[PDB]
Amino acid sequence: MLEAKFEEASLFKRIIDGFKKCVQLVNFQCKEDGIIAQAVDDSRVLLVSLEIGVEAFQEYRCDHPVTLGMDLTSLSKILRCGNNTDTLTLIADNTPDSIILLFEDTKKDRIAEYSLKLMDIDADFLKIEELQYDSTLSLPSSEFSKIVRDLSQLSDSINIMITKETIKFVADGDIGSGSVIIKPFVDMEHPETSIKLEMDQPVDLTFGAKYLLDIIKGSSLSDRVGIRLSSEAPALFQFDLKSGFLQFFLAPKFNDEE
Amino acid sequence: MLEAKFEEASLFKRIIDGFKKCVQLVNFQCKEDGIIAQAVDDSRVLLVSLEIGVEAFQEYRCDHPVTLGMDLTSLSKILRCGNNTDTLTLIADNTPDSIILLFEDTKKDRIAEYSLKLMDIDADFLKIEELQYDSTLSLPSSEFSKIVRDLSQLSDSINIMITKETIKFVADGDIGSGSVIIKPFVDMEHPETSIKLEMDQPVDLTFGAKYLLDIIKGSSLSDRVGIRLSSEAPALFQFDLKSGFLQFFLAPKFNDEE
Amino acid sequence: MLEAKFEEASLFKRIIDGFKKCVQLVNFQCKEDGIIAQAVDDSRVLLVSLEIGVEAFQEYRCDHPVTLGMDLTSLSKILRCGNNTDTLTLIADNTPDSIILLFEDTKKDRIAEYSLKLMDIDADFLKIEELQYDSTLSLPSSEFSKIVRDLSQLSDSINIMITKETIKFVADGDIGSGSVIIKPFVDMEHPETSIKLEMDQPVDLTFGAKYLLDIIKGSSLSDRVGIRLSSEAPALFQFDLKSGFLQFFLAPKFNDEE
């Protein structure tokens, strides 16, 4: 058996929106200590990796490990079916015929029960996070989202450049160009808004804006976004959940296509 | 002559939205005691039947009966032309060249007058309400609307099932399934929200979701919705107006297409 | 050099929306005393003419005259890139390679700099305002906008008719007709809302609704709209800026196409 009760369905809804772009079908490995899920896009340049621990649920129980393969368009369709604030419960049995999603509101009446037919997916799981990235920064998710959205209208390629205490986002395109330059600082009235940066090596990488636009919709899960960039590996964009994370690994455009 | 002054145009606007889906042209029989109107969809599985009495107007006068045949797309276009709160007045003469819609706001200046060319429709009027239905229920229009909207994304056929004190809405589809189960109760703090049910015979009927989605947009006219279901007749969905009603008769899917 | 600092980017954004409809590329002549710009639509029936004086800026400096030819779709794309309240600064040099747009918010950090490649446009500048128009009226921009939007759904041609103290807007079309009749008055509690009219000659002109819909989006720049109409010239619709204007000259439909 498996019973995972979210305190508010909105968290699961936004987690799956993190995947609803950018990728199609997903395996959800539920183990005794929580849920992991991974998904690669078709061009195989962006991996989405979710980890929800037990404390991020209001209740959680998994007797044996169980893998739930799900169509994200169909699961999203099912996930529009409550309020954001209803307690959504995932329920499955030993070898799962299908997953069962059980909503419940503050008015304990009229409980709604959906069921998603589970598909079969072959689980090629990737561990591609490095130990050392060339630079690490963190900034408010809102601010990263606006930078990406704005620059995405000038060209289809956004270029992130890190020098000593200087983070430069640039898009040069046919019509024109744009450049947002941010610098590290500590806001004392609100550590909400600070911009942290550790630079071990300057970086100059360029990413497709399609994918950065995909990545920034995790802003609805975390106040802040962590960006680990490296010339030797895909870049990592991390949104921290209440004891968990949603991660986007994105490969930069190559040298000759910059 | 005919002068029918709505206190607020929004009521007429929402009544015609009740028809703007699901059907195209409509006859409006205006008699000394108010307005009736009827309209069948093309597949001839859903009838929309409106009755507005005199008291639902702020003023009403009809010397002789008169039938106003109207294109609902065109009348809707005309009906976007004020505020929701302006006093809309229908005006016609003995044998009507066309209908005249006269708006007026709280600032008695700049009055706006539209005219809709009347068409010719042959009035095949249907009296298909039964005396006894197998079961009758009533529930808040908001709640019925959310049930229908949610379940409509899983399959194109919603199945209503009434057993002793148990009302079950179910959609099973290709991707998955959903089931909302409600039970009768009396809310004392708010009779707004109660769920009434009289069951003389259990029912198990299945309706096309296209049409239930059409039906639920009468939620903007009434706090509550009344559903009379029967295996021997089309189901009746009723929204009560201030001394009147908007009714949807919907034929269930047949036995072999369930 | 040229440095023109708007106190709020929203003004420039709305000015360019005034052009984003109805016309494609535009020359902006910046001289020592401010900015002028002109643009004709393809059918050559509507001219848009902007004049921003120095006081409409929070800061302004232009050493020598300079013409900035801009793609309005591309400049609009760039103009979605801040907040409405950031101080947008236009910057160019003696002979301009391209225009530079520099945003700045209340939080003086992270300043964003865009650049629009300038095109080459041949400046056929028109001075088509008359001395005497047949009639002049002024009314709230909101009210003119609603009249146009409403009447635009009945036909594609709106007909403005001015008699002694009577301003009549009419659209007769295939489906039906509509007519808004306004009359001059002075509101004392709010000169905001008054309707002024000087009639030297009655007018009966008819305008394509495509273009009136284009014209009314200047409502976001001025509380009021001034309409000079004449049978001997294109009609002039004027929105007054804080020491400036946005003007729409629109040729009426001819006599035989009324």
Residue numbers in the entry:
A (entry chain A), B (entry chain A), C (entry chain A): 1 to 258
What does the published report state?
PCNA is a ring-shaped homotrimeric complex that encircles DNA to act as a sliding clamp, ensuring processivity of DNA polymerases. It also operates as a platform for recruitment of numerous other proteins involved in DNA replication, DNA damage repair, mismatch repair, and chromatin structure and assembly. PCNA levels on DNA are regulated by loading and unloading. After completion of each Okazaki fragment, the Elg1 RFC-like complex (Elg1-RLC), which comprises the Elg1 subunit associated with the Rfc2–5 subunits, functions to unload PCNA from the lagging strand.
We then constructed strains expressing each PCNA mutant as the only copy of the POL30 gene, expressed from its endogenous locus, and found two PCNA mutants PCNA-D17K and PCNA-D21K that accumulate on DNA even with Elg1 present. Retention-prone mutants PCNA-D17K and PCNA-D21K have point mutations on the DNA-interacting region of inner ring. PCNA-D21K is unloaded from DNA slowly compared to WT PCNA, and is retained on DNA during S phase and even in G2/M phase. Elg1 can physically interact with PCNA-D17K and actually shows enhanced interaction with PCNA-D21K, suggesting that accumulation of those PCNA mutants on DNA is not due to a loss of interaction with the Elg1-RLC unloader. The structures (at 2.80- and 2.85-Å resolution for PCNA-D21K and PCNA-D17K, respectively) reveal that the mutations alter the inner pore of the PCNA ring. In both cases, the PCNA pore becomes more electropositive due to the swap of a negative charge to a positive charge. The D21K mutation positions lysine 21 to interact favorably in a bidentate manner with two backbone phosphates of DNA. For the D21K variant, we observed no significant conformational changes relative to wild-type PCNA (Cα RMSD ∼0.48 Å), indicating that the binding of PCNA partner proteins should not be perturbed. Our structural analysis and modeling indicates that the D21K variant strengthens direct interactions with the DNA backbone, without a substantial perturbation of the PCNA structure. The PCNA-D21K mutant provides an excellent tool for testing how PCNA retention on DNA affects cellular function.
